[PDB]
Amino acid sequence: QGLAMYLQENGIDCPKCKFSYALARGGCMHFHCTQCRHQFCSGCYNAFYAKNKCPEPNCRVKKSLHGHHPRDCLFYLRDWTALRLQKLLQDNNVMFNTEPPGCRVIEQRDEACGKETPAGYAGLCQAHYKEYLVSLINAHSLDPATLYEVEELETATERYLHVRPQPLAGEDPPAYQARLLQKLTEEVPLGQSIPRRRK
Ligand SMILES: *[C@H](CNC(=O)c1cc2c([nH]c1=O)CCC2)CC(=O)OC
Ligand code: NA
Ligand SMILES: [Zn+2]
Numbered sequence: 181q182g183l184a185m186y187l188q189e190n191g192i193d194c195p196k197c198k199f200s201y202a203l204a205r206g207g208c209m210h211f212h213c214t215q216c217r218h219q220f221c222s223g224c225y226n227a228f229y230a231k232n233k234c235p236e237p238n239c240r241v242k243k244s245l246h247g248h249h250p251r252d253c254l255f256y257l258r259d260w261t262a263l264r265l266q267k268l269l270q271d272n273n274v275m276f277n278t279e280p281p282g283c284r285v286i287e288q289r290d291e292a293c294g295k296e297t298p299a300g301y302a303g304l305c306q307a308h309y310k311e312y313l314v315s316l317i318n319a320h321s322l323d324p325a326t327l328y329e330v331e332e333l334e335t336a337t338e339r340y341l342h343v344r345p346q347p348l349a350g351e352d353p354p355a356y357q358a359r360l361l362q363k364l365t366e367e368v369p370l371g372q373s374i375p376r377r378r379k
């Protein structure tokens with residue numbers, strides 16, 4: 181099937197029981213293991229913790245079912261435009277397909293995706309093509325923060341460093357942007373349990 185089997189060949193391995201599913205993620209991040217009933221993010225393998233069961237030291241949503249994702253998890257990068265994901269890859273000289281080397285990715289009755297496969301998406305649908313691009317991004321450990329606007333750096337600083345940044349008096353936007361980026365890059369690492377394929 182081309183890239184459909186590339187997505188399906190390296191599927192989803194339960195962090196708890198290590199059972200291997202040969203499935204694509206598309207845009208669905210909530211995965212529930214049949215064998216051990218573990219619930220985890222298929223993009224970063226972090227667990228979804230139930231109410232009052234989150235070890236995250238500064239979690240503010242402790243009393244509800246939720247999960248925490250690194251900034252390069254498909255949970256976030258699925259919402260980028262394909263163009264922005266491609267820019268991140270091109271800036272790092274990473275080859276990506278726009279043409280094949282309905283969507284034929286096989287999902288669960290076990291049936292095919294079958295959604296529209298627009299031109300430039302290598303014979304896949306919007307969601308699976310973005311998953312393909314994000315798998316290249318993850319395989320090369322590329323940092324999406326390098327394409328953030330100031331507003332995304334502010335949100336990231338809050339989410340991952342728990343401080344609300346503010347521009348300094350007389351600090352032009354370029355400097356503010358570079359200060360937030362420099363800080364986030366130094367302190368917050370990329371996903372530590374993201375399943376990164378070979379490059
Ligand atoms: C999105 C929706 N869930 C699943 O696709 C899913 C499929 C299977 C199982 N659990 C799940 O949560 C057990 C056997 C098949 C999550 C996702 O990553 O899609 C693959
Ligand atoms: Na995290
Ligand atoms: Zn399991």
Ligand SMILES: [Zn+2]
Binds near residue numbers: 248250
């Ligand atoms: Zn995630």
Ligand SMILES: [Zn+2]
Binds near residue numbers: 229234240241246247
């Ligand atoms: Zn939490």
Ligand SMILES: [Zn+2]
Binds near residue numbers: 285304305307308
């Ligand atoms: Zn598809």
